[PDB]
Design a protein around this ligand. Structure first.
Ligand code: FAD
Ligand code: FAD
Ligand code: NAP
Ligand code: NAP
Ligand code: MA4
Lengths: 530, 530
């Protein structure tokens, strides 16, 4: 299988495109829009078929935790990115790896039909007249933050409500909602970012939840990004092995350092969970300021008031904004292919339909991991390109149907029953899973003997995308290197001002003690017991 | 002295006005503007004689750490205040205590002249024609954040610079500086707030300092306001008694918890100091995002570039904003009265001119303490009204001239040599000083025996304004009370969503152990040593 299809030029489209040329395939990318990036290409209107983002979105993952395994973000980039500055990375990636030539822009995909199976018959439309073609295999990168989910039916009285109401998707700018009374629904990173942005210049903002989330800043230990302290092999172990509610005590304490969540009033119901927490740096302060007040779930709505689950009422609310998240569909696809039933997506590892017979089609970017997606869809694409070729193989339908069950059953146990968590997954464990398949996952134990400086820094240090190019196929020398020098690149854009003292004999601080102090303790009651 | 003058209807004017009626005097307040609040009354233009604030200023002191000693902020107020919501408190204070009748608006004061001394002859102008009157004593509340300090002469090349440049004072709105390259000077809470606000929607913002400050959020331990953990008798002791550079290690560690200041690049020169640190909740994040880059002092300016002290250069900078702070003058006053020479204000405790012979004039609000000013200028006014009457007395000029020296000599040693710190002062120590004079400062030691629940909470708990109405003159029953119930009022506006489980036999935390665990340890090797 050489002639391959990639639906959409999202992030996922661009990485598969590269993973393809890398496994020596010939890809054709269809893009509905004029340009690349999908979600991350901010436009002011809300054009259909592509996800809207509000002008002021910043990423919630470090640059050295979210760059591709063999392509670090330039040193002069900040560790969290304005959507526009991220797009740039993408553009700069599509330049370096010459991926832009396969993109057919303004060429939406209308149907992907099976041939007499191992190929596919894809109907696309260009500017008016619609052509047709056949492909050996298909990669689907159409996104899943496009269909707004607006659960109006669990807001009795909405009909009666005057004012103005609209879903997060629609949101772009705050100018216009000056000094208005505004209620936002949900504790989506959307809800939070929105509420906050609007709250600075608004009369009052509220924010509804039944369940309440845990808030958390991207600022972490010594102002290093949260993800490079949170996502580290070693810590993952702890989360997995340690008893569930011993990890709960651990979460509670970690999360509460910033502020007491009970007091600020977004204590979660079941702290049991390990759902995705919200990554706003402003929300706690903005509550403190009083610009936002959290609130129980809207019980009922009237013309200009809102009743609440705890029997409170807020009056003269000019605006409701439903940041109740999104859904996803495949309207160019067999209705049996992407079977999604009772909160469960039947896809082998959110990728392959198990009821296929030739493993020639997979869904990339239909997943929401606790860490960055970009390195996730890269290993998604590595595993897939290699399956198509046949260098990699699925088990039997029997096996794949059994995994899909047990994965989902674990998942709901770990992230709750919400319609917002169909695609939740622990970050590393998954990344490992994908790299086992293609045998690109380092086996540290063995490596400890060869290279201990790595072994330590791979397990205890931050689990970069880079790690997955140490062993296995299609490697990158600047992977060992990248890892060892990431501290430079993280501080390049920050540490923009120099004192200039010394570190050979400075009377500042003290240090060295911690070294010598323990060194002597080493040599204690260890006299030769043969 | 009955007939008293209060220059200006600032915060200081309004508290003296109240302190006056309270010590049974008859005041006349002159106000240059149409209304009260001075600084805190946001207007869109920058009218002369009154301090400008930018539309979006929030306080940097808790409500229960900054309300007046006998007038708590309404419970439904947030703990940090939009300038407008603070003004409201003031208006609500001017209502309750009926102070608005003494205010002559649109009546600026032109000269305060000594009579044949113990009175004063004040020339004021109304709408056109200027009248005159005599007063027994004078209280000056004209502010000191009105005269911009623009040190153009330590920016070689400014003449050459095209673009646009203007001082913090002038600032109001960010709209207009979209996608412009902008450099702000200094690490004033101004500089910081400004830089930040502008940075979200700007091409790039820089922020110059030679010296670099310590940044710190208003969010503190368990999301309680910083001031109620920082400003507590007990902690003050530590700061005073402990060796200077042992308090340094203590600051370093406290401050650095949020982020490593070296890495983010505002490591201070001499960490020795206890200068005022900046209170921005946003700046660390906004650096991380890359919207602000800190920078060494501007060495030199050109037409569209800026050279730096460390030999860096930023290019095409459309705007310079000098947030280099303010100064102060008294243009309605004898030039010998407020003698200010080589970084030293010769005023007994930033209040009384020592070269007077009848102590009948004092300056209130000419001071910048590490805590809230509002309770500071209240004890300033209590001490003063009582001096006028003669219930309180200054020492001899010999003594007062010696204090002024030693105070200043301590001060420079403690806050550095900057002309941004002429009026710096440790918060409590001063508040105590003022309350000693009128004997309203509790002596805890004695009270330990009488009331231990207080004694503990007065020393170890937060040092509210309320404390100074426990003993001494003009008290308030709701002072003991206020103190004991402040936790309610702080949580009233925050804790706006409740779970409803239990706290008599609930499973999914633990607690009580820490109690019983230590309790048993108490009764160890203490068997009757008579
Ligand atoms: C607000 C927000 C913030 C996020 N922040 C982060 C973050 O900081 N870090 C992180 O790792 N992840 C983040 N994510 C998740 C993830 O990065 C995005 O979901 C990611 O951009 C998805 O890329 P994709 O290629 O899968 O989908 P998209 O980028 O949505 O790609 C959609 C593409 O498919 C095309 N398309 C659709 N239909 C057709 C058709 N019929 N034919 C041809 N083309 C079609 C579209 O036109 C478009 O080019 C965020 C998500 C949201 C909503
Ligand atoms: C941005 C900013 C934020 C701050 N935030 C805080 C905070 O959160 N907490 C805190 O404790 N401190 C804060 N401060 C410091 C402090 O609160 C202010 O300096 C305080 O408002 C000063 O009050 P005042 O009465 O001394 O002066 P102002 O409130 O400036 O009083 C000036 C008034 O006097 C009048 N006047 C002037 N000249 C004359 C004259 N010749 N005759 C008659 N009337 C005259 C004016 O017309 C005006 O009405 C802040 C300062 C700034 C700049
Ligand atoms: N980088 C960024 O800054 C950024 C910004 C925005 C979004 N994102 C991305 O997009 C997602 C963030 O969340 P989202 O806002 O897009 O959608 P989401 O994750 O699905 O969350 C939407 C929220 O609406 C809540 N909700 C729905 N119905 C509700 C009801 N009746 N009452 C109360 N709450 C209700 C949900 O709570 P329950 O599910 O518990 O009911 C959920 O918390 C993440 O997956 C994130 O990666 C990222
Ligand atoms: N609630 C709020 O958010 C808020 C907001 C704004 C202001 N305020 C208050 O207002 C007061 C004043 O703040 P402000 O910023 O207006 O004035 P400021 O605190 O005096 O700050 C002025 C800054 O300019 C710097 N500067 C002066 N000369 C310089 C030079 N030659 N090179 C480089 N930098 C130089 C100063 O540094 P040097 O000390 O080295 O001169 C200082 O950091 C503060 O006490 C604060 O409490 C509060
Ligand atoms: O968060 C600051 C709080 O902590 C301090 O205690 C210090 C202690 O005195 C110091 O010796 C230790 O270093 C170890 O740190 C703590 C934490 O600041 C003070 O006792 C307390 O009043 C203050 O409000």
């Amino acid at each position: 299988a050489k002639k391959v299809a990639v639906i959409g030029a999202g992030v996922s489209g661009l990485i598969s495109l590269k993973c393809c040329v890398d496994e020596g395939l010939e890809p054709t990318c269809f893009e509905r829009t004029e340009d690349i990036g999908g979600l991350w290409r901010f436009k002011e209107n809300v054009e259909d078929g592509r996800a809207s983002i509000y002008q002021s979105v910043i990423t919630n993952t470090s640059k050295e935790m979210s760059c591709f395994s063999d392509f670090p973000m330039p040193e002069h980039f900040p560790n969290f990115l304005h959507n526009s500055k991220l797009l740039e990375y993408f553009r700069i990636f599509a330049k370096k790896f010459d991926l832009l030539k396969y993109i057919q822009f303004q060429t939406t995909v209308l149907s992907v039909k099976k041939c007499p199976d191992g190929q596919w018959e894809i109907v696309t439309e260009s500017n008016g007249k619609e052509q047709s073609a056949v492909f050996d295999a298909v990669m689907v990168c159409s996104g899943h933050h496009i269909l707004p989910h607006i659960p109006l039916q669990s807001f009795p009285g909405i009909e009666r409500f005057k004012g103005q109401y609209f879903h997060s998707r629609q949101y772009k700018h705050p100018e216009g909602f000056e000094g208005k009374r505004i209620l936002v629904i949900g504790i989506g990173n959307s809800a939070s970012d929105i509420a906050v942005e609007l709250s600075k210049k608004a009369a009052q903002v509220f924010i509804s939840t039944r369940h309440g989330s845990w808030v958390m800043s991207r600022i972490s230990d010594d102002g290093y990004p949260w993800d490079m302290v949170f996502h580290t092999r070693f810590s993952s172990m702890l989360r997995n092995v340690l008893p569930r509610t011993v990890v709960k005590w651990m979460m509670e304490q970690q999360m509460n350092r910033w502020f007491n969540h009970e007091n600020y009033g977004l204590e979660p119901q079941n702290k049991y969970l390990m759902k995705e927490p919200v990554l706003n740096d402003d929300l706690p302060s903005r509550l403190l300021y009083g610009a936002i007040k959290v609130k129980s779930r809207v019980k009922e709505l009237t013309e200009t008031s809102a009743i609440f689950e705890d029997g409170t009422v807020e009056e003269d609310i000019d605006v409701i904004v439903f940041a109740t998240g999104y859904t996803f569909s495949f309207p160019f696809l067999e209705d049996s292919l992407v079977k999604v039933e009772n909160n469960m997506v039947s896809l082998y590892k959110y990728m392959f339909p198990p009821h296929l017979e030739k493993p020639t089609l997979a869904c990339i970017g239909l997943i929401q991991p606790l860490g960055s997606i970009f390195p996730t869809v890269e290993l998604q694409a590595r595993w897939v390109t290699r399956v198509f070729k046949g260098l990699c193989t699925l088990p039997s339908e029997s096996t794949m149907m059994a995994d899909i069950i047990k994965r989902n059953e674990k998942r709901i146990d770990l992230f709750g029953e919400s319609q917002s968590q169909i695609l939740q997954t622990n970050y590393i464990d998954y990344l490992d899973e994908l790299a086992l398949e293609i045998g690109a996952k380092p086996d540290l134990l063995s490596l400890l003997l060869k290279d201990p400086k790595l072994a330590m820094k791979l397990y205890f240090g931050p689990c970069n995308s880079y790690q997955y190019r140490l062993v296995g196929p299609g490697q990158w020398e600047g992977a060992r290197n990248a890892i060892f020098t990431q501290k430079q690149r993280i501080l390049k854009p920050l540490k923009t001002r120099a004192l200039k003292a010394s570190s050979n004999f400075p009377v500042s601080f003290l240090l060295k003690i911690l070294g010598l102090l323990a060194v002597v303790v080493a040599f204690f009651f260890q006299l030769q017991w043969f």
